[PDB]
Amino acid sequence: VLRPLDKLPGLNTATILLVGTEDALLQQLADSMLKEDCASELKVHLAKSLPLPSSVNRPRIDLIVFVVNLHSKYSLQNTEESLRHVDASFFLGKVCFLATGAGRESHCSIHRHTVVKLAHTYQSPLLYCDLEVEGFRATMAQRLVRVLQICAGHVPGVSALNLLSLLR
Amino acid sequence: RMTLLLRLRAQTKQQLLEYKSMVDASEEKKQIEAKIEDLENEIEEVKVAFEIK
Amino acid sequence: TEEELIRECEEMWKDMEECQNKLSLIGTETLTDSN
């Protein structure tokens, strides 16, 4: 089970962890997360299920973004199968719920209420976007970095705990 | 190298704060309609606490 | 200059490590179901 503070932070390293069944959209979102030259060393981590095979030297994950593809019920049922491997101290600030595929609204095997209920019953931000289009990635990936600098503590006024009090 | 060092100091002044807040939360050992009211009370008294800060 | 601020920065890094091992002994990795 992943923990928010088991590992010490880096120096300027803010290492997000995208968790989603589809890895093409995760790779595109990670490419957009590093396209801009930010002031933080973003070591983006990809995944499919949070079990996350136990490999030491893994950095202090400062953010987990459960990319829930609303087109596929697998991306949800695997997300709730990955939410049972998270800390209760991880859902405070360092957990976001990306809902890709939404807005198209014709391919959604998941009603967008079910994902908002999922993200509200874990008390964590739910950030909607559409990862298949770059024009909505580069503006949402820069949202996952400004969240990441908040949870990683790079903005020296706002904690991860302070984040969900702002995104509630 | 000093501006970057100041960025490091500002980052670790706050990561230490996160570590200490979690340590105190684990040191500590119901009305869900008010469990968010004494929770919103925090971010109004935290807000005064690290606003004057 | 750097030598003065780095002393404080590394002292609070020692505190960071002390609080991380404190968080490494509670070690509950407490789980969260649908509730």
């Binding site: 120096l11 300027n12 | 490091l8 | 780095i6 920065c9 590394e10 890094w13």
Partner: peptide
């Protein structure tokens, strides 16, 4: 581990 220079000097950046 010790940070000091071991972390900051290694990341020259």
């Amino acid at each position: 581990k010790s940070f000091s220079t071991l972390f900051l000097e290694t990341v020259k950046r």
